[PDB]
């Protein structure tokens, strides 16, 4: 059983529990990223998280992002699937579900400092190292991750990414 949900730091036990479990997966799958730093972003009022759920409560993966509506782009802060569930197509399904939602939120671009060890995954998701969207849009807005490479993905406006 695999579902999806978009979580917000709204102060309820329900979202909090899901968010905490997602945060734990990020730090495990991202040893070098300080948990304190992960917590700072995941629980920040401007960040939302979409998670992959099993049996509607077990978090096996997710994507934490910040939508910049005026510029029509979304910064992907963290992305991960728990080790034991990786390489099964869940990361691809999560991204397609994320693209679908961004498309409905009027977001045209996705930016992210992709982990040097996962650039291959992002390329397979349509991200490129080439900057195409006006750079003044993101410069000074997105966080720079040390061991990451800036990558971007254009959201096709009317294609069906999932449903």
């Amino acid at each position: 059983l695999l579902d999806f949900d978009i979580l917000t730091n709204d102060g309820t036990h329900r979202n909090m529990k899901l968010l905490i479990d997602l945060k734990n997966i990020f730090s495990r799958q991202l040893p070098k990223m300080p948990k304190e730093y992960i917590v700072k972003l995941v629980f920040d009022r401007h960040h939302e998280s979409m998670v992959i759920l099993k049996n509607k409560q077990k978090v096996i993966g997710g994507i934490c992002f910040r939508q910049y509506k005026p510029q029509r782009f979304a910064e992907v802060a963290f992305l991960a699937v728990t080790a034991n569930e990786q390489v099964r197509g869940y990361g691809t399904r999560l991204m397609n579900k994320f693209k679908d939602h961004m498309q409905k939120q009027n977001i045209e671009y996705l930016l992210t400092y992709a982990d040097n060890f996962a650039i291959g995954y992002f390329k397979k998701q349509g991200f490129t190292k080439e900057h195409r969207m006006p750079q003044e849009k993101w410069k000074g807005y997105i966080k720079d991750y040390d061991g990451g490479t800036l990558m971007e993905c254009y959201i096709h406006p009317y294609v069906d990414y999932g449903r």
Binding site: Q29, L30, P31, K32, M33, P34, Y37, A83, Q86, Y113, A114, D115, N116, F117, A118, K143, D144, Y145, D146, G147, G148
Partner: peptide, 6 residues
């Protein structure tokens, strides 16, 4: 951040 991983 140190984008390291897995």
């Amino acid at each position: 951040g140190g984008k390291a991983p897995r």
